[PDB]
Design a protein around this motif. Structure first.
Motif, mmCIF file in Angstrom:
data_model
loop_
_atom_site.group_PDB
_atom_site.id
_atom_site.type_symbol
_atom_site.label_atom_id
_atom_site.label_comp_id
_atom_site.label_asym_id
_atom_site.label_seq_id
_atom_site.Cartn_x
_atom_site.Cartn_y
_atom_site.Cartn_z
ATOM 1 N N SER C 50 0.824 -1.200 0.000
ATOM 2 C CA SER C 50 0.000 0.000 0.000
ATOM 3 C C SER C 50 0.863 1.256 0.000
ATOM 4 N N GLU C 51 1.296 1.658 -1.191
ATOM 5 C CA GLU C 51 1.562 3.052 -1.536
ATOM 6 C C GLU C 51 2.797 3.641 -0.865
ATOM 7 N N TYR C 52 3.399 2.918 0.065
ATOM 8 C CA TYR C 52 4.703 3.298 0.580
ATOM 9 C C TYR C 52 5.608 2.102 0.395
ATOM 10 N N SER C 53 5.013 0.919 0.330
ATOM 11 C CA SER C 53 5.816 -0.255 0.054
ATOM 12 C C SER C 53 6.187 -0.346 -1.416
ATOM 13 N N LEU C 54 5.354 0.174 -2.313
ATOM 14 C CA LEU C 54 5.700 0.134 -3.729
ATOM 15 C C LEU C 54 6.817 1.119 -4.055
ATOM 16 N N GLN C 55 6.727 2.338 -3.515
ATOM 17 C CA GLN C 55 7.793 3.322 -3.680
ATOM 18 C C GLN C 55 9.116 2.799 -3.145
ATOM 19 N N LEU C 56 9.125 2.377 -1.885
ATOM 20 C CA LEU C 56 10.338 1.849 -1.279
ATOM 21 C C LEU C 56 10.851 0.630 -2.027
ATOM 22 N N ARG C 57 9.951 -0.211 -2.527
ATOM 23 C CA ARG C 57 10.376 -1.414 -3.227
ATOM 24 C C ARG C 57 11.123 -1.077 -4.506
ATOM 25 N N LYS C 59 12.635 1.805 -5.243
ATOM 26 C CA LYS C 59 13.888 2.453 -4.876
ATOM 27 C C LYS C 59 14.941 1.433 -4.473
ATOM 28 N N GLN C 60 14.556 0.429 -3.688
ATOM 29 C CA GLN C 60 15.491 -0.631 -3.331
ATOM 30 C C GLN C 60 15.984 -1.368 -4.560
ATOM 31 N N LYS C 61 15.096 -1.608 -5.524
ATOM 32 C CA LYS C 61 15.503 -2.310 -6.738
ATOM 33 C C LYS C 61 16.565 -1.525 -7.493
ATOM 34 N N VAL C 62 16.318 -0.233 -7.706
ATOM 35 C CA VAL C 62 17.307 0.600 -8.385
ATOM 36 C C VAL C 62 18.628 0.572 -7.636
ATOM 37 N N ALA C 86 14.856 17.785 -15.366
ATOM 38 C CA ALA C 86 13.759 17.253 -14.569
ATOM 39 C C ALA C 86 14.289 16.138 -13.686
ATOM 40 N N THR C 87 13.959 16.204 -12.390
ATOM 41 C CA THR C 87 14.627 15.389 -11.379
ATOM 42 C C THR C 87 14.660 13.915 -11.748
ATOM 43 N N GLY C 88 13.653 13.431 -12.461
ATOM 44 C CA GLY C 88 13.565 12.023 -12.796
ATOM 45 C C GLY C 88 14.760 11.401 -13.493
ATOM 46 N N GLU C 89 15.085 11.864 -14.704
ATOM 47 C CA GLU C 89 16.108 11.203 -15.504
ATOM 48 C C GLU C 89 17.505 11.721 -15.221
ATOM 49 N N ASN C 90 17.621 12.876 -14.569
ATOM 50 C CA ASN C 90 18.920 13.300 -14.070
ATOM 51 C C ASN C 90 19.534 12.231 -13.179
ATOM 52 N N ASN C 197 10.844 2.498 -12.906
ATOM 53 C CA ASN C 197 9.947 3.632 -12.779
ATOM 54 C C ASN C 197 10.532 4.589 -11.756
ATOM 55 N N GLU C 198 10.655 5.854 -12.134
ATOM 56 C CA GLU C 198 11.298 6.858 -11.305
ATOM 57 C C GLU C 198 10.388 8.037 -11.029
ATOM 58 N N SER C 199 9.112 7.929 -11.373
ATOM 59 C CA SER C 199 8.161 8.913 -10.895
ATOM 60 C C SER C 199 7.793 8.652 -9.448
ATOM 61 N N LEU C 200 8.046 7.441 -8.953
ATOM 62 C CA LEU C 200 7.770 7.119 -7.562
ATOM 63 C C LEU C 200 8.911 7.501 -6.639
ATOM 64 N N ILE C 201 10.141 7.534 -7.149
ATOM 65 C CA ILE C 201 11.290 7.873 -6.319
ATOM 66 C C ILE C 201 11.282 9.352 -5.969
#
Ligand SMILES: [Mg+2]
Ligand SMILES: [Mg+2]
Ligand SMILES: [Mg+2]
Ligand SMILES: [Mg+2]
Ligand SMILES: [Mg+2]
Ligand SMILES: [Mg+2]
Ligand SMILES: [Mg+2]
Ligand SMILES: [Mg+2]
Ligand SMILES: [Mg+2]
Ligand SMILES: [Mg+2]
Ligand SMILES: [Mg+2]
Ligand SMILES: [Mg+2]
Ligand SMILES: [Mg+2]
Ligand SMILES: [Mg+2]
Ligand SMILES: [Mg+2]
Ligand SMILES: [Mg+2]
Ligand SMILES: [Mg+2]
Ligand SMILES: [Mg+2]
Ligand SMILES: [Mg+2]
Ligand SMILES: [Mg+2]
Ligand SMILES: [Mg+2]
Ligand SMILES: [Mg+2]
Ligand SMILES: [Mg+2]
Ligand SMILES: [Mg+2]
Ligand SMILES: [Mg+2]
Ligand SMILES: [Mg+2]
Ligand SMILES: [Mg+2]
Ligand SMILES: [Mg+2]
Ligand SMILES: [Mg+2]
Ligand SMILES: [Mg+2]
Ligand SMILES: [Mg+2]
Ligand SMILES: [Mg+2]
Ligand SMILES: [Mg+2]
Ligand SMILES: [Mg+2]
Ligand SMILES: [Mg+2]
Lengths: 80, 79, 207, 86
Positions: C50-57, C59-62, C86-90, C197-201
Motif C-alpha cells: 500500500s503506496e509506501y511499500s511500492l515506492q520503497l520497493r 527504490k530498493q531495486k534501483v 527534470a529530477t527524474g532522468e537526471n 519507474n522513477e516517478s515514484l522515487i
RNA sequence: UAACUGAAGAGUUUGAUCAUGGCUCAGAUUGAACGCUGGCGGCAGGCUUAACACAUGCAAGUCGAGCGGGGGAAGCGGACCUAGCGGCGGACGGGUGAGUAAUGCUUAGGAAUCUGCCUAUUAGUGGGGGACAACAUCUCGAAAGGGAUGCUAAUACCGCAUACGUCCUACGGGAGAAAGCAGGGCCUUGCGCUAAUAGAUGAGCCUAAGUCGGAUUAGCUAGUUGGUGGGGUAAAGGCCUACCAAGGCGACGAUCUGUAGCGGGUCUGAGAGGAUGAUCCGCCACACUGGGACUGAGACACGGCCCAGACUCCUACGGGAGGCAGCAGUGGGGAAUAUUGGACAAUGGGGGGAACCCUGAUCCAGCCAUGCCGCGUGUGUGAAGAAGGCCUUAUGGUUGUAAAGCACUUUAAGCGAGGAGGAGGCUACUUUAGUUAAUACCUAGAGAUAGUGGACGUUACUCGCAGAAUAAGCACCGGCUAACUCUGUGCCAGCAGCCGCGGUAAUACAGAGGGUGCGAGCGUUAAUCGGAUUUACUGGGCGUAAAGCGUGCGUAGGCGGCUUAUUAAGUCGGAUGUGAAAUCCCCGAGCUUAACUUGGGAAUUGCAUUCGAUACUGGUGAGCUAG
C-alpha cells in the motif's frame, strides 16, 4: 604604517594568499583597507599563479604604503 | 548639504530656546497600516522670535548645550 | 562498506533479474526458487503493498542494481533535484556515468561487483592515469582503457565474450582488440529499461 | 614587574614624573602672579606680570609638558584681561 | 548562458456519524551525552557547567654604528661578550563575555579635534653649563632590598643664540627649537634630530531612527532644563562653578524592576515568520574585588605603578612576595570536552645599518567515529539443493549458490626501493645607471658558474613484494510503519511514542529460526523549527462547541458625504552614494573523485540624497445638501 602584505587563507598544506593593503597593526587575517590581487604558489593546470592589479598598487605605494619583501618580489615578478 | 526639519513650536518658556515637535507618518512592519510618530527637539533661539503654536524650520549644528543641537532657520508660517 | 551476501536472494524479493551473477547459463535459472520471495513465509499469500511499500520497493531495486548505499544515493537525488532538467532522468544519468558501471558495459568484467574489483584494484586507466575510485563521474570524451600491466589475467577473456552477445550500447565506442573505450556522452532515458519507474522515487524523497 | 625592562620602565617613570611636576608647577606659578596682578587693577604692573609669563609658558609648551593649544589659550585669555584694564 | 521551482498527511472521544478541540507520530538539524559495536584515509571541530582556586615551564624584547665602565680568549694593539645610563617596542598580537536595556551595537549622516612610525614639500642643526647611575669606599638584613659618601660620559637634562614658515596680537609688534653617529676619501653620501604644512592611517566627539519583558510599577527630576561671566579640554558641551531664571522628561510608557554583550550571520520554513549569536570577520566591555593617577603619539595599561579589601606564600619574626578569562597542565564542578609536543622553514609582528636576535601569533605534529566526505572488509563458478538449524500435513519446506571444493585478484593496511612542491632569496664573481672631486663608498638594474637555506618529513606521489590472507555490526518485524512463525510464561514476569498488549493457541512479553532497514556505524535521552490555519499579516473564530461587557453616555484614539482650486506629507517613478570581506546561490578552475579550496558574477530591494508624476489618502482655501 600602511603596508601591503599577504593574507593566508587556503587549506592545510596548500595555501592561497590575498594581496592586501592594510594598517600594519591589524591581525594578519583580520581588518584591511583593500585587496588588490592574489597569489597561488601551487597552481596546477589551468589555474593562475599570480594576479596583481598594478594601478592600485602604484596608487597606494605613492600614498605611503610599504610593500613586504615577498610582495615587492611578486610585483617585480609580475609585469614580466 | 544641510538637512532640515519642519515642525510645530510647542514651548518657548526658556531663554534662547524653543522645543519643536516633529511628526512623521510611518507604515507598520507586520500589519502595514500607518502610524503617527512624534519627536520633540530642543532647538536654539537667539532673538526669542518663535512663539507657542508657530511652525518653524530647524537645521542641525554642533552642540549648544546638554540636549540642544538644532538651530532655528526661519518661522515659515507665523501664527 | 559494500554488500557481501547472497546475490539471488535479492533477486526474488524484487521479482526482476537485477543483472547480478552474470553467466552463460543463467537465464535466471540458477536459483529455481525464482518468483518466490525469500525465507519462511516467502510467497505465503497476497500482499497489501500500500503506496509506501511500492515506492520503497522500486527504490530498493534501483539501488541494488548499481550497488549504491543510502547516503550516496540520497546525495545523488539532492544533486539531481538541483540541475535545471527534470529530477527524474537526471538521477539515472548520474548513475550511468559512474566508473564501474561504464567499465561494466564496455565488457571488461562480467558483473558490476567485479567491474568494481577491477577499478578499485588499480587496473583501469582513465585519460592515462590509474584511478582507483569506483564512483568517479565519467564525462564526454573520457578514454577508459585497461592498464597494460594486467592485460593477461584470464578474468577478462570470458568477460569479453559474455559482453558480446549482449547490447553493445549506443554511447560507448569499445573494441575488444586493444581494450580501449572512448566513452561518448551519457545516455538518455530510452537506452535503459522502462520497467524502472522513477516517478515514484521523486515522491518517495519528498514525503 | 616580572621582567627586567618592566622595572626599568617603572624606574624611569619616577624620574620623569619628578622632572615634569617641577615644570608644571613653574607654569602655574607665573599664571598665578599674572592673575594676582590683574586683581590689583594696575594696568602697568599687570602688563609686566604678563611679559614674564609668556616666555615660560611657551618654553614649557615646546618641551611637550603642556599642549601648544593650551598655551595658546592661556596667552589669549590672559591678554584679553589686561587689555580690558585700560 | 546561468544565479530560479514553490506547500502531502496519520492515530486517538462514539454502538455508529459529522463537527469542534487538545494530545501524539512520520522530517530537517546539534560544539551533544549515554548504550552496543568498531578497519582506514581527507577535511574540519573539541569546558556550553565554577568571570571557581591555581603547583611547574614557556607567552616581549632588541640596539655596542647613542654612552662610560668592565671582562675573558687570542696573537701592547685587533676581535668578542654585557650588569648600568639612553632610544624604540612593551596601548599590537593572544584570552573571556562578568557588567551593560543604551554614554553600547546597527543603518545614514555631521564638527568643534589630535595623531609615533610612513610619503611629499620647505627652513635648519650655532655655542655653552650643571647633574646623575655605573664605579670606588662605608652600611642595616637570614634573604629580598636599601643607606651614607665621594667620582664620572652621552643622541639623558637645562639656559643662551638664530628661525622660511609656526603661536599671541590692541596689527605697532611680541614669543618659542635641535644631537650626534657611521662608511669611504676638511668633502662626500647614509642613519638620525628640530620647526611647519598636507596626505595616509588610527583614534575622540555629535545627531536622527531602529534594537527583550513587566502597569500585580504612574508620576520622575533640584546641575535637574536654560542663560550670562570665569575655569577646564586635543576638541563642541552643566564637563565644572558662581549668579539669573525657572524649567525638562512621561500612556508614542518616563520612573522602577527582571533578563541580556551587539552585528555579519547559523538552523528551520513554500513563503511570511520562528529560534539562535560556538567555530570565521567587525565593534564594545573586562583582566582577583573597589578607588586613582603616572609615563607616553597613544593606556586610566592582562604578564606596569599607588592604596584599599579579601585570599594564598616565604621567614632567621627582623622582613617580604603574588594574581592562567595567554599556550600546555593540576585540583574541583559536571552528563561532557585533548599534549606540561616541534620550528621560526613559510605568512606576519618587534628591534637593528646589517649580520641577526625575539615571537605558545602562526605554521605544523599528538589525542578523540564529534561531524562531513570517500574507500575497504574480496571476485567467478559451484545442485551431491551436503550436513546442521528451524517449521512441518513427516514427506517435504526454508536457510540457499549460501557454504564447501575448484579457479583467480591484491585496492587500503604491511615490507622494500625511488621522490615533487611548499624557497622566494642570500652569499660570493662580472658589468651598467645613479648622485659626487670621483670610475670611492653607498642605493638601483641587468649574467653564468658555483655555494647555502624545510619544522612537517620514513611527506604527497610513483614502482615493486607476499599471501584471502589483517578487517561487520546495530535497531526493528500489532496498527501507524518496510518486515512472521514456533517454544516458555498465565493480568505474573514484563512491554509501551500514541492507541494499547499480558487472565493456558500471545504475529505486542522472553529466547530461537526466518525477514526488514541502515551500515563503521546503529539506537536512546535532551533541545530548536516543521507538520500546527494550534495566536491566523499572509491565514481562524465568538446563537447552541471556548468566546458580545447588564445597559447607556462620553475622553484619547481610529475611521469619515459631494464638487473644485492648490500643496506635494503618505503614494509612485528615475538618478546618484552607500549596503566590509567571508557565508548563501550560479557559471568553472585545482585537489585521482568527493567533501574542501578558489576566480568571476549574481544577491545584499535596505538606507539616504536629489529631480519629477498627481489618480487616491492627508493639509489649505472656496462652494453644496442625500448624512
Ligand atoms: Mg554630552
Ligand atoms: Mg631597554
Ligand atoms: Mg647591556
Ligand atoms: Mg556579557
Ligand atoms: Mg634630548
Ligand atoms: Mg631660547
Ligand atoms: Mg644644544
Ligand atoms: Mg551657554
Ligand atoms: Mg565658557
Ligand atoms: Mg557655564
Ligand atoms: Mg515601562
Ligand atoms: Mg550576563
Ligand atoms: Mg506554515
Ligand atoms: Mg612613545
Ligand atoms: Mg602625558
Ligand atoms: Mg602591559
Ligand atoms: Mg597572567
Ligand atoms: Mg589554560
Ligand atoms: Mg567530577
Ligand atoms: Mg617567522
Ligand atoms: Mg600501501
Ligand atoms: Mg623543495
Ligand atoms: Mg505492514
Ligand atoms: Mg503459548
Ligand atoms: Mg517479542
Ligand atoms: Mg561512510
Ligand atoms: Mg504558525
Ligand atoms: Mg478555531
Ligand atoms: Mg457557550
Ligand atoms: Mg447584550
Ligand atoms: Mg474624536
Ligand atoms: Mg481625519
Ligand atoms: Mg513626497
Ligand atoms: Mg558581502
Ligand atoms: Mg468646507
Amino acid at each position: 604604517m600602511v603596508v601591503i602584505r599577504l593574507a593566508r587563507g587556503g587549506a592545510k598544506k596548500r595555501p592561497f594568499y590575498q594581496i592586501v593593503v592594510t594598517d600594519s597593526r591589524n591581525a594578519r587575517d583580520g581588518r584591511f583597507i583593500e585587496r588588490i590581487g592574489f597569489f597561488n604558489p601551487t597552481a596546477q593546470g589551468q589555474a593562475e599563479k599570480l594576479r596583481l592589479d598594478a594601478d592600485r598598487f602604484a596608487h597606494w605605494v605613492s600614498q605611503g604604503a610599504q610593500p613586504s619583501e615577498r610582495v615587492a618580489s611578486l610585483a617585480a615578478q609580475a609585469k614580466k | 548639504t544641510v538637512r532640515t526639519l519642519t515642525g510645530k513650536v510647542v514651548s518657548d518658556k526658556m531663554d534662547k530656546s524653543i522645543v519643536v515637535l516633529i511628526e512623521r507618518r510611518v507604515q507598520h512592519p507586520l500589519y502595514g497600516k500607518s502610524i503617527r510618530r512624534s519627536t520633540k527637539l530642543h532647538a536654539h533661539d537667539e532673538n526669542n522670535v518663535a512663539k507657542i503654536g508657530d511652525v518653524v524650520t530647524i537645521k542641525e549644528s554642533r552642540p549648544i548645550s546638554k540636549t540642544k543641537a538644532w538651530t532655528l532657520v526661519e518661522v515659515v508660517e507665523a501664527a | 562498506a559494500r554488500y557481501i551476501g547472497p546475490k539471488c536472494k535479492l533477486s526474488r524479493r524484487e521479482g526482476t533479474d537485477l543483472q547480478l551473477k552474470s553467466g552463460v547459463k543463467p537465464f535466471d535459472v540458477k536459483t529455481k526458487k525464482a518468483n518466490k520471495a525469500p525465507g519462511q513465509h516467502g510467497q505465503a499469500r497476497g500482499g497489501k503493498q500500500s503506496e509506501y511499500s511500492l515506492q520503497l520497493r522500486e527504490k530498493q531495486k534501483v539501488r541494488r542494481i548499481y550497488g549504491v548505499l543510502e547516503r550516496q544515493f540520497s546525495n545523488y537525488y539532492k544533486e539531481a533535484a538541483r540541475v535545471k532538467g527534470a529530477t527524474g532522468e537526471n538521477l539515472l544519468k548520474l548513475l550511468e556515468s559512474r566508473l564501474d558501471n561504464v567499465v561494466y558495459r564496455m565488457g571488461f568484467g562480467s558483473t558490476r561487483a567485479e567491474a568494481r574489483q577491477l577499478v578499485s584494484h588499480r587496473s583501469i586507466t582513465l585519460n592515462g592515469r590509474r584511478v582507483n575510485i569506483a564512483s568517479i563521474q565519467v564525462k564526454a570524451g573520457d578514454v577508459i582503457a585497461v592498464h597494460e600491466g594486467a592485460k593477461q589475467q584470464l578474468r577478462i577473456k570470458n568477460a569479453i565474450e559474455l559482453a558480446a552477445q549482449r547490447g553493445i550500447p549506443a554511447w560507448i565506442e569499445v573494441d575488444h582488440s586493444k581494450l580501449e573505450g572512448t566513452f561518448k556522452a551519457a545516455p538518455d532515458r530510452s537506452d535503459l529499461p522502462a520497467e524502472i519507474n522513477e516517478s515514484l522515487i521523486v515522491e518517495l524523497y519528498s514525503k | 614587574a616580572n621582567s627586567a625592562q618592566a622595572k626599568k620602565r617603572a624606574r624611569q617613570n619616577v624620574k620623569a614624573r619628578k622632572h615634569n611636576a617641577s615644570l608644571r608647577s613653574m607654569v602655574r606659578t607665573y599664571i598665578k602672579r599674572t592673575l594676582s596682578a590683574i586683581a590689583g587693577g594696575d594696568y602697568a604692573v599687570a602688563t609686566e606680570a604678563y611679559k614674564k609669563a609668556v616666555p615660560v609658558i611657551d618654553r614649557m609648551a615646546d618641551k611637550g609638558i603642556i599642549h601648544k593649544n593650551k598655551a595658546a589659550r592661556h596667552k589669549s585669555r590672559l591678554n584679553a584681561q589686561v587689555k580690558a584694564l585700560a
